[PDB]
Design an enzyme around this catalytic site. Structure first.
Site, PDB file in Angstrom:
ATOM      1  CD  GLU A 175       2.219  -2.092 -68.600  1.00  0.00           C
ATOM      2  OE1 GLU A 175       2.476  -2.921 -68.333  1.00  0.00           O
ATOM      3  OE2 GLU A 175       2.913  -1.282 -68.111  1.00  0.00           O
ATOM      4  CG  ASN A 204      -2.710 -10.565 -63.724  1.00  0.00           C
ATOM      5  OD1 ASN A 204      -2.897  -9.922 -64.651  1.00  0.00           O
ATOM      6  ND2 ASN A 204      -1.542  -9.410 -62.940  1.00  0.00           N
ATOM      7  CG  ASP A 245      -7.774 -10.204 -62.296  1.00  0.00           C
ATOM      8  OD1 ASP A 245      -7.022 -11.142 -63.203  1.00  0.00           O
ATOM      9  OD2 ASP A 245      -8.400  -9.397 -62.987  1.00  0.00           O
ATOM     10  CB  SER A 256      -6.924 -11.610 -66.228  1.00  0.00           C
ATOM     11  OG  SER A 256      -5.741 -10.496 -65.263  1.00  0.00           O
ATOM     12  CG  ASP A 286      -0.868  -8.439 -67.261  1.00  0.00           C
ATOM     13  OD1 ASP A 286      -2.293  -8.010 -67.563  1.00  0.00           O
ATOM     14  OD2 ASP A 286      -0.408  -7.612 -65.836  1.00  0.00           O
ATOM     15  CG  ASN A 292      -6.123  -7.615 -68.217  1.00  0.00           C
ATOM     16  OD1 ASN A 292      -6.885  -7.828 -67.991  1.00  0.00           O
ATOM     17  ND2 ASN A 292      -5.157  -8.031 -67.018  1.00  0.00           N
ATOM     18  CG  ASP A 344     -12.105   2.440 -74.041  1.00  0.00           C
ATOM     19  OD1 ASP A 344     -11.567   3.078 -75.626  1.00  0.00           O
ATOM     20  OD2 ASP A 344     -12.699   1.685 -73.860  1.00  0.00           O
TER      21      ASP A 344
END
EC number: 3.2.1.17
Length: 129
Positions: A35, A46, A48, A50, A52, A59, A101
């Site tokens: 990562e 990203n 969208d 956002s 990381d 994110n 989650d």
């Protein structure tokens, strides 16, 4: 800072990640490797809107607040900057919430792609833990 593999293994162990939610320490160290290459300040933007953040590439659309991501959630209730420090605690504490989650560690693409189904124990071999 850039952690050493064994150095990270020890830190994550100290933070209760070994077999947390059924995932052995090796999974966690492997995820960090692919990562962020063990880098605490790594960031990735990203499509969208956002980003990381940190060693576990958390994110901003669902987990932390960076203040500039479109329809963000702050499910870990922490600013994204706090995930960029040398002290992995904030990242660890949030990662524990993410893994509880839904789809376990499938939340980390790099882990799905590179670690899932491999000898992840290799990441902790040769370390004193």
């Amino acid at each position: 800072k850039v952690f050493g593999r064994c150095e990270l293994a020890a830190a994550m162990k100290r933070h209760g990640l070994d077999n947390y939610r059924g995932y052995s320490l090796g999974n966690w160290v492997c995820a960090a490797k692919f990562e962020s290459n063990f880098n605490t300040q790594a960031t990735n933007r990203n499509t969208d809107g956002s980003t990381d953040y940190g060693i576990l590439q958390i994110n901003s659309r669902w987990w932390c607040n960076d203040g500039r991501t479109p329809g963000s959630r702050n499910l870990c209730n922490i600013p994204c900057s706090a995930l960029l420090s040398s002290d992995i605690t904030a990242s660890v504490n949030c990662a524990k919430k993410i893994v509880s989650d839904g789809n376990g560690m499938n939340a980390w693409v790099a882990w799905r792609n590179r670690c899932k189904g491999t000898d992840v124990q290799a990441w902790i071999r040769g370390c004193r833990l």
